[PDB]
Amino acid sequence: VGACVLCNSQTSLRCGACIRRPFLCCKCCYDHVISTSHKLVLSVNPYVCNAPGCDVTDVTQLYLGGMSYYCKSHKPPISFPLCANGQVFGLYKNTCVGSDNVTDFNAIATCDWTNAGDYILANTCTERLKLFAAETLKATEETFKLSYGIATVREVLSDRELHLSWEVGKPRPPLNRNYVFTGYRVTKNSKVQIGEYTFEKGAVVYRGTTTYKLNVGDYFVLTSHTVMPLSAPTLVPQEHYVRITGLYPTLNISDEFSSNVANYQKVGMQKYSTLQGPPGTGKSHFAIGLALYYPSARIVYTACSHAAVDALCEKALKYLPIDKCSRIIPAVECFDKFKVNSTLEQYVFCTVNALPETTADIVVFDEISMATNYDLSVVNARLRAKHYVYIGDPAQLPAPRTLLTKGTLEPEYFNSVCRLMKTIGPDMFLGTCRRCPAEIVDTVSALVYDNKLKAHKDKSAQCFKMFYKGVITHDVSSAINRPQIGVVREFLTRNPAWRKAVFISPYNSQNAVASKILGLPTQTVDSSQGSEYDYVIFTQTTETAHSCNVNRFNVAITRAKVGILCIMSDRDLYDKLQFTSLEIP
Amino acid sequence: RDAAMQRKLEKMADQAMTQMYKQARSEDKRAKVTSAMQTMLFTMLRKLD
Amino acid sequence: WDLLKYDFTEERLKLFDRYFKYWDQTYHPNCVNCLDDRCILHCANFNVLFSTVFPPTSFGPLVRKIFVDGVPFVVSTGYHFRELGVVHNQDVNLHSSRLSFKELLVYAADPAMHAASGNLLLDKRTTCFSVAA
Ligand SMILES: [Zn+2]
Ligand SMILES: [Zn+2]
Ligand SMILES: [Zn+2]
Ligand SMILES: [Zn+2]
């Protein structure tokens, strides 16, 4: 029993062909089943013919025979069809509104999430339909994870390097950081979890959370989890106030957080606020000055990944009292300097999936770009706050979309908060970049910040760009550009100091080859987000949409604090770069 | 003919409605007692010392 | 006697050897191994006799610790009848995962958990052995 996701009318009908089994009113269920291939409908009892050895499950081909559902073949003389009169027979038939258009629901329910239009519709439909679309997309991703074959340790070459035998008849998932596996050991009549692992091509080099002496028999599977159903909206209704509501500012503040003080007051002006912080602008500084500006307020700091929550905890250790901070860890090594699992603490640092059902004065959700509507909705469901502070950057990386193959996802379609801060603009903005040199700041501000981001540092004269296509070779799930790595080698020989730089590439295979040949530390642009280095050497390695993405390029080029070398294969981004052009040797 | 075909149908439809209603009610009570029993066991175990 | 000793089979055979040495019919210390109902009665009689020897605190449910979802429980897995001897469960599950409705129903019925959680009782109003409150 439930409420029609399209009508909110109390209903006992669920669609059996939809993976999330959403609740639908009689009229909505009728229109959906007659407009798609979805013919299985669930009630308190499923709408299926109960005849012995009969397979008729279509709702339009079933009748109420006596006390059961029967097909036309097996029905008694006294029967009336399940699907008739423009409605579906079921509970609360009199109370039913229906919908003029079921196109959005039909598209969301029947889409395979392989087109950018599906995500656009998900981010632009009704709020209940947004929740349903997030549920469907996450469940589809979880199921698609099960489609991958099992990789078993066939022989151990050495430590940190393995040999894998893959399951026959099933595809092999890409071996990168986005696909974190889990090891499993063989026992008598059961199976035991031995750690979470990631794999790369060597033979496979494996990086595990915990070290082991694993041998033949252990096999690695991408762990999937149950998708709980969403109830709260991705965003609470917007309320604007005339006075600081529920907060009491401190009368003494330091110069470290003075510049944000006005923005802090804006936190009290509205139910929720959106913050756009470019790289190196002090998003953590703002988030912790919010607490220092309202010392009595109980604040919950949340982020999708453990890394961002750990960074928030690191900042809190720097400015906030340790006894007022508690890190919530569910039953991966994370921050372990706060007291563990203390819900009632004034400052509560926790990831999205491990949050407790609680209230707070302020809920600060960091790194909004990585978030999905699922995370936003579940955060609103578990946390009750007078004020919400969404912190991130639409110009940075979103959550990866494995099922998306056709089309590219724009920043406005990353999530509801992303939609707001891309359409109506962020509630407040961090306009000073303290990390990157002037060239990089100007480049990113002209690219994705509408020439608003300003440079704290001067020009470092160490920002260089080179236009070099090279040769692109493709392996199972990545791309390699050896001539670009050779150009980097020549640059390193002519500029030995740049050997302190960190190589960054959008492809894991290019990173592996660069680590093997150059000796530099290597980072994917996806994993480089949130970090910073003095010198950065970046090779585009392709001209595909993945490497030419403006958010990805911004993240890649904002990792440098002093100097950056850019080997560009795309002419558009190379010309966009405000760097000193270099000639190919 | 076509009226004795109908006025005898709302009776069986109404009783089917009532039946699956009480079946849903009983099923909900089933979940309720499941939750109560499990929480009672987990509360009584915590005293084990 | 040791409090934790529950199987007194050897003492039962010793007593039968001592006092009824030349009684032709065979004797089964635990009534599980009987051949049919008549042998059940015939062994139960001698067990009724011999059960007046052993301490009263060795008769009743036999508890064992079993973890479910990593949670240590205390559940009944066997019984020590005065007349039938020792009977062990055959489908005891150790280190199980989830408790269905039947499993919760059973584990909420037997006095194992209720007794193991309660406090010790001593009542002077009666003579029958008392367990707890
Ligand atoms: Zn459907
Ligand atoms: Zn409806
Ligand atoms: Zn049939
Ligand atoms: Zn016998």
UniProtKB/Swiss-Prot annotation, chain B:
Subcellular location: Host cytoplasm, Host perinuclear region; Host cytoplasm; Host endoplasmic reticulum
Entry function: Plays a role in viral RNA synthesis. Forms a hexadecamer with nsp7 (8 subunits of each) that may participate in viral replication by acting as a primase. Alternatively, may synthesize substantially longer products than oligonucleotide primers. Interacts with ribosome signal recognition particle RNA (SRP). Together with NSP9, suppress protein integration into the cell membrane, thereby disrupting host immune defenses.
Subunit annotation: Interacts with nsp7, nsp13 and nsp12 to form the replication-transcription complex (RTC): nsp12, nsp7, two subunits of nsp8, and up to two subunits of nsp13. Eight copies of nsp7 and eight copies of nsp8 assemble to form a heterohexadecamer dsRNA-encircling ring structure.
Record protein name field: Non-structural protein 8
Source species of the chain: Severe acute respiratory syndrome coronavirus 2
Lineage of origin: Viruses, Riboviria, Orthornavirae, Pisuviricota, Pisoniviricetes
Section of the entire sequence shown: 3993 to 4041 of 7096
